[PDB]
Amino acid sequence: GFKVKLEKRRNAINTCLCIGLDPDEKDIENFMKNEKENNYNNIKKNLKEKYINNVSIKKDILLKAPDNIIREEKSEEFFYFFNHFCFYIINETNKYALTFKMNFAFYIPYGSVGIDVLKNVFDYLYELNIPTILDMKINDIGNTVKNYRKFIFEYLKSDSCTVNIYMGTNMLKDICYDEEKNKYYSAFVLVKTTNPDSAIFQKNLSLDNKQAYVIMAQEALNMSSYLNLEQNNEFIGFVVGANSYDEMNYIRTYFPNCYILSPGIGAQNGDLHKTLTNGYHKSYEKILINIGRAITKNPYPQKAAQMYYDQINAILKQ
Amino acid sequence: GFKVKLEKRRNAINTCLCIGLDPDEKDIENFMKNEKENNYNNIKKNLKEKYINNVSIKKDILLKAPDNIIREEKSEEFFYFFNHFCFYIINETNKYALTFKMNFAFYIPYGSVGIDVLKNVFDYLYELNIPTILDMKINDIGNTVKNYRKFIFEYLKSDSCTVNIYMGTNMLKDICYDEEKNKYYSAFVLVKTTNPDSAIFQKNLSLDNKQAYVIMAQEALNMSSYLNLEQNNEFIGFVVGANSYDEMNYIRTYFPNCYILSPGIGAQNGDLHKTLTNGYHKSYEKILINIGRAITKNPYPQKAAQMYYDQINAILKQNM
Numbered sequence: 044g045f046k047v048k049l050e051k052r053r054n055a056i057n058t059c060l061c062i063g064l065d066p067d068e069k070d071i072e073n074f075m076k077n078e079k080e081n082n083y084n085n086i087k088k089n090l091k092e093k094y095i096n097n098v099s100i101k102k103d104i105l106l107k108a109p110d111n112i113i114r115e116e117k118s119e120e121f122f123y124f125f126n127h128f129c130f131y132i133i134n135e136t137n138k139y140a141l142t143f144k145m146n147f148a149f150y151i152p153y154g155s156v157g158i159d160v161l162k163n164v165f166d167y168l169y170e171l172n173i174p175t176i177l178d179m180k181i182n183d184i185g186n187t188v189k190n191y192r193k194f195i196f197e198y199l200k201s202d203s204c205t206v207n208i209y210m211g212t213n214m215l216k217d218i219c220y221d222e223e224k225n226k227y228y229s230a231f232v233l234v235k236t237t238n239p240d241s242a243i244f245q246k247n248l249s250l251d252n253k254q255a256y257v258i259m260a261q262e263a264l265n266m267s268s269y270l271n272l273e274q275n276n277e278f279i280g281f282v283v284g285a286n287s288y289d290e291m292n293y294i295r296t297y298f299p300n301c302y303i304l305s306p307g308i309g310a311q312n313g314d315l316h317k318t319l320t321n322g323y324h325k326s327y328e329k330i331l332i333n334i335g336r337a338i339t340k341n342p343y344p345q346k347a348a349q350m351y352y353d354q355i356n357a358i359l360k361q
Numbered sequence: 362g363f364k365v366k367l368e369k370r371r372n373a374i375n376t377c378l379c380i381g382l383d384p385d386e387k388d389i390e391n392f393m394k395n396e397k398e399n400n401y402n403n404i405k406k407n408l409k410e411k412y413i414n415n416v417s418i419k420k421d422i423l424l425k426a427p428d429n430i431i432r433e434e435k436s437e438e439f440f441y442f443f444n445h446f447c448f449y450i451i452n453e454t455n456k457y458a459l460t461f462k463m464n465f466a467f468y469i470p471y472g473s474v475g476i477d478v479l480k481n482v483f484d485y486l487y488e489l490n491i492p493t494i495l496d497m498k499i500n501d502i503g504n505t506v507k508n509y510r511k512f513i514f515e516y517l518k519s520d521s522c523t524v525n526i527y528m529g530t531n532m533l534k535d536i537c538y539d540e541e542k543n544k545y546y547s548a549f550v551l552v553k554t555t556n557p558d559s560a561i562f563q564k565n566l567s568l569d570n571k572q573a574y575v576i577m578a579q580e581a582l583n584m585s586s587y588l589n590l591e592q593n594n595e596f597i598g599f600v601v602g603a604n605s606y607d608e609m610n611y612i613r614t615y616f617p618n619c620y621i622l623s624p625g626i627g628a629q630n631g632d633l634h635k636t637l638t639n640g641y642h643k644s645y646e647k648i649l650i651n652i653g654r655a656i657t658k659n660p661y662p663q664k665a666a667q668m669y670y671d672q673i674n675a676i677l678k679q680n681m
């Protein structure tokens with residue numbers, strides 16, 4: 044189960060850093076141009092790694108020397124460099140990551156080619172046995188929602204995803220549970236988001252002088268109990284933005300042992316000390332700190348990841 | 362623009378039926394086995410049509426006789442029958458449809474292969490010049506959401522999509538407008554959904570005893586005015602479930618000329634007369650009636666589409 048998988052890695056590497064892998068078009072251009080100019084140093088390092096032989100889509104193209112890809116198969120150049128950029132980031136930073144979070148939006152805008160990269164990326168992480176999150180923030184009626192669950196948990200074999208339950212909590216019956224296989228899956232529900240204008244609905248809406256993000260949080264756990272997730276070492280957790288300090292603390296108390304996923308530090312202006320302190324828990328896999336572009340876009344991603352790794356671990360010593 | 366495109370087609374065919382194309386795994390097997398038993402009747406009908414030549418992905422596979430697909434390229438069988446089922450439905454029913462709405466969820470569960478089909482489906486509809494909707498209910502921060510706008514409006518060339526703005530209205534700045542291209546796009550935001558438990562947040566949440574779906578509706582239009590969509594013949598509309606009769610009438614009243622997209626009739630228990638009467642508008646493209654499984658799962662989709670077509674047009678007569 045996901046809680047067992049999270050806990051074991053946390054003991055292995057003693058952090059709660061969640062590394063975000065959201066590659067955009069310029070990241071792929073820059074990666075392709077740097078490798079071309081520096082003798083494809085990082086791609087040749089990728090082709091030495093163990094588990095690249097265990098990806099299921101277009102291994103024939105992925106494993107051939109880069110000199111060939113330019114001159115030979117011009118069609119598949121983008122696929123090749125897109126996939127190798129993701130492998131490069133994973134190879135460079137994974138020792139520091141408790142989990143990896145891939146945002147689906149970044150892998151769909153080119154058509155099927157990016158979903159092939161997404162599949163290989165999740166295949167890669169599964170073989171490294173690193174916990175994964177798919178940031179897809181899915182939402183629909185029950186019958187439709189089943190398709191997301193197949194994609195996320197059967198096809199990609201992801202450990203968790205993000206969910207927007209604004210249309211109704213019952214959708215989690217067809218996300219976090221599969222009656223036909225008697226299987227249970229973990230999800231993070233959107234509670235407090237880092238949009239600058241997120242207060243308009245999450246705070247300025249109310250029931251019984253309770254703000255909406257609290258009502259939504261409590262609905263999420265009531266469904267978790269009904270689905271019996273925790274007994275099967277799965278959970279429904281919360282996405283709480285790094286800047287929402289008051290709510291972060293409001294959540295951690297009164298939901299003492301809930302799992303929190305927090306984005307916002309780095310590219311979106313943050314206070315790492317204050318975010319991690321308000322969300323803190325002994326089992327600090329319950330307070331995941333997502334860092335994306337601050338690592339993916341840094342010229343030395345290994346060094347950027349280590350920096351946040353050491354920063355987080357220093358704060359935890361309290 | 363999408364308002365001009367909707368209005369021009371509505372005059373041509375005089376309906377507001379929105380046919381939903383949400384093919385599931387059983388639909389693709391059932392199609393494959395009926396074609397296998399019936400001499401590939403419908404697939405051969407698909408390959409005679411003009412515009413199948415205007416699909417962009419693996420057209421070499423789509424256009425070959427089905428006889429070959431079984432014996433030779435078996436890896437590509439599923440792609441072939443999935444894609445041809447969609448063409449079959451579109452060919453059989455497009456004559457009755459003001460718009461087609463494709464729900465993204467049904468095209469992702471097998472991996473990339475279904476996105477190839479989604480691309481070909483939108484290519485096909487674009488070339489028949491039938492207005493399109495992608496039901497993706499997208500939602501994220503501004504930087505991420507721009508990727509959806511590229512997928513929906515550049516890659517698929519859709520005319521509109523669905524949006525969930527619960528994380529914040531400002532995401533519509535990076536969905537319905539592209540500053541670098543000075544282009545504008547249309548969207549439908551979720552107001553009232555057909556989930557049986559949809560009241561719990563859309564209704565039981567409020568500010569100053571205005572219900573959440575009302576505040577969300579008005580935030581959506583304030584953003585439409587700020588972006589100047591209606592001046593560029595685009596709009597931001599509302600998704601209002603067919604069963605939400607009271608709310609339907611509240612929206613059509615206090616948002617008189619807004620565009621409504623209503624699903625729920627057919628597979629999910631509906632009263633078509635009452636839904637369309639509460640939502641009615643002279644320019645009745647402003648009240649799109651989605652029918653999905655009631656057409657796609659019916660053994661004769663053409664006649665089922667005609668059934669709802671004639672049904673809708675009769676109701677539109679009594680509202681004058």
Ligand SMILES: O=c1ccn([C@@H]2O[C@H](COP(=O)(O)O)[C@@H](O)[C@H]2O)c(=O)[nH]1
Nearest residue numbers: 063065146236237306310334335336505
């Ligand atoms: O409230 C939220 C929910 C999700 N994300 C996602 O988290 C990642 C943030 O990474 P970064 O801002 O560190 O680059 C992006 O994928 C973004 O879509 C947020 O930023 N805020």
Ligand SMILES: O=c1ccn([C@@H]2O[C@H](COP(=O)(O)O)[C@@H](O)[C@H]2O)c(=O)[nH]1
Nearest residue numbers: 187383464554555624628629652653654
């Ligand atoms: O509140 C909503 C919003 C969207 N849809 C979508 O409308 C379609 C309805 O299909 P059907 O019930 O006509 O088959 C599906 O794609 C579904 O995801 C709903 O049903 N309810």
